Amino acid sequence: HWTYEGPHGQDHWPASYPECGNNAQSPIDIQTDSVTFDPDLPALQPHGYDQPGTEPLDLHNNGHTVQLSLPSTLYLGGLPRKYVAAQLHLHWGQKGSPGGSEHQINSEATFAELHIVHYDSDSYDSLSEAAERPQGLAVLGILIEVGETKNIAYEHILSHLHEVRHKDQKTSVPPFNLRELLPKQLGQYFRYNGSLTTPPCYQSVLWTVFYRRSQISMEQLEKLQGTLFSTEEEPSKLLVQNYRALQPLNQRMVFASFIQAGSSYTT
Numbered sequence: 001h002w003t004y005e006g007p008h009g010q011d012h013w014p015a016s017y018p019e020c021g022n023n024a025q026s027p028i029d030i031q032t033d034s035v036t037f038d039p040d041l042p043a044l045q046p047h048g049y050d051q052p053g054t055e056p057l058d059l060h061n062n063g064h065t066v067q068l069s070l071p072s073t074l075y076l077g078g079l080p081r082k083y084v085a086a087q088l089h090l091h092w093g094q095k096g097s098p099g100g101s102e103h104q105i106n107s108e109a110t111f112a113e114l115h116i117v118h119y120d121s122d123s124y125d126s127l128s129e130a131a132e133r134p135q136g137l138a139v140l141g142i143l144i145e146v147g148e149t150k151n152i153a154y155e156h157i158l159s160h161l162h163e164v165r166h167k168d169q170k171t172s173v174p175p176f177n178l179r180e181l182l183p184k185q186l187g188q189y190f191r192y193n194g195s196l197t198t199p200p201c202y203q204s205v206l207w208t209v210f211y212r213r214s215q216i217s218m219e220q221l222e223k224l225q226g227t228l229f230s231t232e233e234e235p236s237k238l239l240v241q242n243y244r245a246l247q248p249l250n251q252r253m254v255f256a257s258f259i260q261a262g263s264s265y266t267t
């Protein structure tokens with residue numbers, strides 16, 4: 001039903017999903033001259049990422065993004081609660097246009113963004129249940145830019161897009177090292193309270209956005225931008241610009257797990 005553009009586009013999400021119009025939404029523009037360094041933010045400690053089970057992982061084109069199912073055996077050890085992995089998916093723009101990421105750092109967007117979604121298994125039994133609760137979810141946001149070389153880790157996913165071009169189609173992806181989808185310096189990240197970036201826009205996400213960006217080749221980007229369709233059949237329409245517009249910070253604080261010389265903030 002909902003879409004990014006059109007009568008049911010994001011500008012009209014609040015009309016159907018009340019929370020999309022609330023004031024602690026995501027994504028946001030993280031301006032470093034306004035973040036607060038928190039020396040107590042722990043290392044994320046992703047567990048099981050190197051080997052996501054031994055069974056094939058499901059890759060699904062749900063019409064809004066391409067989604068990879070993840071086993072609950074994977075989890076993050078550096079958060080207030082034990083957050084177990086549920087899935088990961090992507091957001092991108094379109095060939096010939098700028099942007100594509102959801103979050104921005106110092107008002108700069110990149111070409112795409114990877115989201116690895118987890119939920120509090122200590123308190124809840126399912127992603128869906130946790131999705132409606134305060135800090136019920138923990139999502140990792142990795143901004144993606146273009147580099148000179150092909151990124152093998154991302155290729156493990158991108159090499160399968162041609163198998164799920166139509167909405168609702170699915171395929172299998174052999175387990176691979178998910179840690180390689182993450183950028184360098186995992187110890188440098190931003191943390192803030194936000195929401196799902198798609199309807200129902202529940203304000204249940206404890207967000208972690210990495211400071212460093214991951215890089216894929218220009219060829220990999222063009223493939224991510226124009227392989228999948230948002231339609232189930234002909235006529236076909238390419239799935240593009242599936243990223244939400246920036247939402248007001250609305251006086252929330254954004255914390256940084258690091259600080260360096262020349263940082264726009266102090267200790």
Ligand SMILES: *[C@@H]1O[C@H](CO)[C@@H](O[C@@H]2O[C@H](CO)[C@@H](O[C@@H]3O[C@H](CO[C@H]4O[C@H](CO)[C@@H](O)[C@H](O)[C@@H]4O)[C@@H](O)[C@H](O[C@H]4O[C@H](CO)[C@@H](O)[C@H](O)[C@@H]4O)[C@@H]3O)[C@H](O)[C@H]2NC(C)=O)[C@H](O)[C@H]1NC(C)=O
Nearest residue numbers: 038080134135190191192193194205206207252253254255
């Ligand atoms: C996302 O949004 C949530 C909800 O608003 C925030 O969670 C709150 O965080 C604050 C600040 O850390 C918590 O308040 C502080 O609680 C401390 C005690 O912590 C223990 O007890 C609480 C209550 O049971 C537990 O929630 C917590 O897990 C611990 O077990 C107090 O020591 C603090 O008091 C001191 O600091 C305040 C200033 O903040 C002074 O005024 C006091 O005098 C004193 O020096 C403080 O009260 C609050 O409990 C949390 N609420 C909930 C529901 O968890 C997240 O921090 C926020 N995350 C981000 C990234 O923004």
Ligand SMILES: Nc1ccc(C(=O)c2ccc(-c3ccc(S(N)(=O)=O)cc3)cc2)cc1
Nearest residue numbers: 115117127128129131139195196197198199
């Ligand atoms: N009709 C519904 C169907 C499924 C659900 C969910 O359980 C659900 C859970 C999480 C998400 C979700 C949305 C966005 C993001 S994001 N883009 O912020 O990383 C993550 C999870 C969506 C739906 C809710 C209502």
Ligand SMILES: [Zn+2]
Nearest residue numbers: 089091115197
């Ligand atoms: Zn997302």
